[PDB]
Scaffold this motif. Structure first.
Motif, PDB file in Angstrom:
ATOM      1  N   UNK B 106       0.833  -1.201   0.000  1.00  0.00           N
ATOM      2  CA  UNK B 106       0.000   0.000   0.000  1.00  0.00           C
ATOM      3  C   UNK B 106       0.865   1.247   0.000  1.00  0.00           C
ATOM      4  N   UNK B 107       0.427   2.264  -0.746  1.00  0.00           N
ATOM      5  CA  UNK B 107       1.047   3.594  -0.705  1.00  0.00           C
ATOM      6  C   UNK B 107      -0.075   4.629  -0.620  1.00  0.00           C
ATOM      7  N   UNK B 108       0.304   5.854  -0.301  1.00  0.00           N
ATOM      8  CA  UNK B 108      -0.656   6.930  -0.170  1.00  0.00           C
ATOM      9  C   UNK B 108      -1.118   7.145   1.259  1.00  0.00           C
ATOM     10  N   UNK B 109      -2.126   8.004   1.435  1.00  0.00           N
ATOM     11  CA  UNK B 109      -2.617   8.349   2.767  1.00  0.00           C
ATOM     12  C   UNK B 109      -1.534   9.039   3.589  1.00  0.00           C
ATOM     13  N   UNK B 110      -0.597   9.702   2.906  1.00  0.00           N
ATOM     14  CA  UNK B 110       0.526  10.392   3.548  1.00  0.00           C
ATOM     15  C   UNK B 110       1.828   9.614   3.549  1.00  0.00           C
ATOM     16  N   UNK B 112       4.734   7.847   1.427  1.00  0.00           N
ATOM     17  CA  UNK B 112       5.306   7.948   0.083  1.00  0.00           C
ATOM     18  C   UNK B 112       6.020   6.702  -0.437  1.00  0.00           C
ATOM     19  N   UNK B 113       6.093   5.624   0.337  1.00  0.00           N
ATOM     20  CA  UNK B 113       6.692   4.383  -0.161  1.00  0.00           C
ATOM     21  C   UNK B 113       5.698   3.243  -0.081  1.00  0.00           C
ATOM     22  N   UNK B 114       5.731   2.325  -1.057  1.00  0.00           N
ATOM     23  CA  UNK B 114       4.934   1.101  -0.962  1.00  0.00           C
ATOM     24  C   UNK B 114       5.425   0.317   0.264  1.00  0.00           C
ATOM     25  N   UNK B 115       4.491  -0.052   1.150  1.00  0.00           N
ATOM     26  CA  UNK B 115       4.756  -0.776   2.382  1.00  0.00           C
ATOM     27  C   UNK B 115       3.940  -2.073   2.368  1.00  0.00           C
ATOM     28  N   UNK B 116       4.543  -3.181   2.746  1.00  0.00           N
ATOM     29  CA  UNK B 116       3.842  -4.445   2.715  1.00  0.00           C
ATOM     30  C   UNK B 116       2.766  -4.554   3.774  1.00  0.00           C
ATOM     31  N   UNK B 117       1.565  -5.000   3.369  1.00  0.00           N
ATOM     32  CA  UNK B 117       0.444  -5.287   4.266  1.00  0.00           C
ATOM     33  C   UNK B 117       0.487  -6.813   4.481  1.00  0.00           C
TER      34      UNK B 117
END
Ligand SMILES: [Cl-]
Ligand SMILES: [Cl-]
Ligand SMILES: [Cl-]
Ligand SMILES: [Cl-]
Ligand SMILES: [Cl-]
Ligand SMILES: [Cl-]
Ligand SMILES: [Cl-]
Ligand SMILES: [Cl-]
Ligand SMILES: [Fe+3]
Ligand SMILES: [Mg+2]
Lengths: 60, 325
Positions: B106-110, B112-117
């Motif tokens: 996921x990225x966005x919502x403040x 700036x990097x894709x982070x694993x869910x």
């Protein structure tokens, strides 16, 4: 009547401008100023479209 | 693919390079084949069958690109991803992918990097799909649906809570395969591979009760932010549930031709009929910004926006409409 009703606790407080906001289906945000809400305002408006929302609070 | 887009465009989210709202379909050009188009409040992404993701629109919440100095992606541009993409969804100011290795980012919502869910998923090659709307996402694999984000209307679980950052199991059928999850801004409807509604949760629109709607098989369920639409292809009908202040309830005047496709945006619907071969595309609902066609008064009924020689695929966003040939 109005487009929708939104719970006050679901809105986002923007401390810079001192207003509560909530997404609008047009891409902008509905807004109600803190001072207006304090004084009894219950309608938030969108700066980019004609939709309006009623702001409410439910204990349930 | 040939892609047309129209409606709200203040953040250049139609991929046309300009910021003017449009009321008729405009050719939007990124020989890649489109798998799907997903839309947030002010950004749009297109996933091609080759695994590439392209996007345009607002980046002030990190929706598309890691550069904080980039406020907006003015024209279609590749989205940097950790691995090839097999599925994508958007929320209000977020973008979520499922990659070819079965990882969810996921990225966005403040951020700036894709982070694993970290969704509990099997490494057995069962299909992994993602769905998103507003401030919620769900991930589906087999009989299970996991979700995260807002829970102020108990859409994920009870009791209510402001937000769940880590995924929770929303539903496990313990039997039937889940086909997809249709999502409104604060409610969802889980549909099985037989077209039966298996679960529904959150602030369900007026007139919709799960126990009165689990009888019929072979439905297609679509959601606007504040309404549910049930397309019954056997009878050629669309049944709507909601307040319908701006013509969002599907018009009940008899259609002279079969419906072959339906999609929804935030507060409008897109309908495709087969007029045999010629295909007509119509819009209904809230169209102030041109997303239903040139008549922008949100008057009831179906407004014709295009005619095509092959069957199109349609996608809706926040007062935007997409037609893919
Ligand atoms: Cl807040
Ligand atoms: Cl929100
Ligand atoms: Cl209104
Ligand atoms: Cl491709
Ligand atoms: Cl990570
Ligand atoms: Cl028709
Ligand atoms: Cl008009
Ligand atoms: Cl028409
Ligand atoms: Fe608006
Ligand atoms: Mg439950």
């Amino acid at each position: 009547s109005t487009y929708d009703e939104i719970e006050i606790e679901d809105m986002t407080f923007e401390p810079e401008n001192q207003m509560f906001t909530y997404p609008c289906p047009c891409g902008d945000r509905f807004q109600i100023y803190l001072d207006d809400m304090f004084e009894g305002e219950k309608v938030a408006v969108c700066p980019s479209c004609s939709l309006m929302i009623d702001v409410v609070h439910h204990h349930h | 693919s040939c892609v047309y887009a129209f409606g709200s465009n203040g953040q250049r989210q139609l991929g046309l390079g300009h910021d003017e709202d449009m009321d008729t379909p405009q050719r939007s050009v990124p020989g890649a084949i489109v798998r799907k188009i997903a839309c947030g409040g002010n950004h749009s992404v297109m996933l091609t069958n080759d695994g590439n993701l392209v996007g345009c629109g607002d980046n002030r919440r990190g929706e598309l690109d890691s550069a904080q100095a980039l406020r907006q992606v003015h024209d279609w541009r590749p989205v940097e991803v950790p691995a090839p993409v097999v599925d994508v969804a958007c929320g209000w100011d977020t973008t979520v992918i499922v990659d070819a290795d079965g990882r969810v980012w996921q990225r966005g919502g403040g951020c700036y990097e894709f982070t694993q869910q970290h969704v509990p998923l099997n490494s057995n090659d069962e299909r992994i799909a993602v769905y998103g709307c507003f401030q919620n996402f769900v991930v589906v694999q087999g009989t299970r649906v996991y979700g995260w984000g807002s829970n102020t209307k108990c859409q994920l679980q009870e009791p209510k809570s402001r937000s769940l950052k880590e995924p929770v199991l929303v539903y496990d059928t313990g039997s039937v395969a889940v086909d997809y999850v249709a999502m409104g801004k604060d409610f969802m409807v889980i549909v099985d591979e037989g077209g039966r509604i298996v679960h529904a949760s959150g602030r369900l629109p007026t007139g919709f009760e799960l126990k009165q709607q689990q009888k019929r098989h072979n439905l297609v369920v679509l959601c606007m932010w504040t309404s549910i639409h049930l397309w019954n292809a056997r009878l050629n009908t669309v049944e709507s549930f909601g307040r319908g202040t701006h013509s969002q309830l599907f018009p009940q005047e008899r259609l002279d031709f079969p419906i072959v496709g339906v999609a929804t945006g935030s507060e409008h619907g897109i309908l495709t009929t087969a007029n045999q071969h010629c295909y007509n595309v119509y819009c209904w609902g809230w169209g102030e910004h041109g997303n239903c066609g040139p008549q922008k008064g949100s008057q009831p009924g179906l407004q014709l926006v295009g005619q095509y020689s092959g069957k199109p695929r349609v996608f809706g966003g926040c007062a935007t409409t997409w037609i893919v040939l």
